[PDB]
């Protein structure tokens, strides 16, 4: 029998923390309408009174309005929703004192779920940013139109990073195979000021093109073996788990 607790500004506003194994004591005096508030996103399915004729019911979205329509209307309210199902113990105060205008619910279940998901997201993000166990290859040469050249190129075993200055137009970078044929390679632009082009492959030779100027990049320390991707993500500290099941 969860008896709610009133505000300090006025006794007529009362709060209760939800619990799926307890009911709430609702006092429905004569001549007042009580505002039962559901949380946002909650989908009402149905409800059931202890006496449909005893009380008045009115719903608009997620707002419940009740009102005693008869004497000795001491019954129970059970309103089921998409997420949870509430439980009320309606009981009129025959003295018309201690009226309740709103019943506000505080939900520890959704709060716990949000805290869990936020903690999991924070852990995944920390694991991504930590990037420990990283080895960097800096043996890169270039020959061609040096005016479109990176100020830095390196790779971490999985991706190749080309860094460009702030006054340089970002060029288009292609993948060169053994016979000399260029082909597209997927690209992501990273860096605090979008100055780094990260291509998703480690390769011995690269082609940088901007307009009618061309520059060839050479990985002088190409490692064919690389680092195996057992986790499914860019980091060794984050897994990719099969949610879909099926």
């Amino acid at each position: 029998l969860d008896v709610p607790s009133s505000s300090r500004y006025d006794h007529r506003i009362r709060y209760v923390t939800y619990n799926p194994a307890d009911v709430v004591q609702v006092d429905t005096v004569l001549g007042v309408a009580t505002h039962i508030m559901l949380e946002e996103g909650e989908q009402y399915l149905t409800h059931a009174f202890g006496d449909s004729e005893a009380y008045a019911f009115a719903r608009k979205g997620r707002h419940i309005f009740i009102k005693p329509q008869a004497e000795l209307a001491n019954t129970n309210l059970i309103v089921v929703t998409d997420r949870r199902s509430y439980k009320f113990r309606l009981q009129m105060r025959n003295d018309r004192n201690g009226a309740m205008y709103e019943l506000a619910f505080r939900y520890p279940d959704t709060q716990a779920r949000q805290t869990r998901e936020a903690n999991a997201r924070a852990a995944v993000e920390a694991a991504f940013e930590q990037r420990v166990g990283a080895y960097y290859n800096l043996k890169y040469m270039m020959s061609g139109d040096k005016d479109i050249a990176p100020v830095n190129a390196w790779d971490d075993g999985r991706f190749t990073y080309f860094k460009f200055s702030a006054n340089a137009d970002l060029p288009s970078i292609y993948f060169v195979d053994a016979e000399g044929n260029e082909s597209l390679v997927p690209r992501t632009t990273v860096g605090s000021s979008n100055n780094i082009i990260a291509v998703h492959k480690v390769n011995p030779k690269w082609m940088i093109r901007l307009g009618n100027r061309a520059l060839a990049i050479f990985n002088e320390a190409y490692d064919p073996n690389g680092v195996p991707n057992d986790t499914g993500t860019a980091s060794p500290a984050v897994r990719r788990v099969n949610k879909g099941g099926n």
Binding site: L138, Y140, M141, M142, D145, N152, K163, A214, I217
Partner: peptide, 28 residues
């Protein structure tokens, strides 16, 4: 009798290091 032109091929004579200085994204 007509074939589409190729893009410019870079010259191979001025081969030089790309990294004059270590980047700070390696934290060095």
């Amino acid at each position: 009798c007509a074939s589409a032109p190729k893009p410019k091929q870079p010259s191979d004579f001025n081969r030089e290091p790309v990294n004059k200085t270590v980047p700070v994204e390696i934290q060095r």
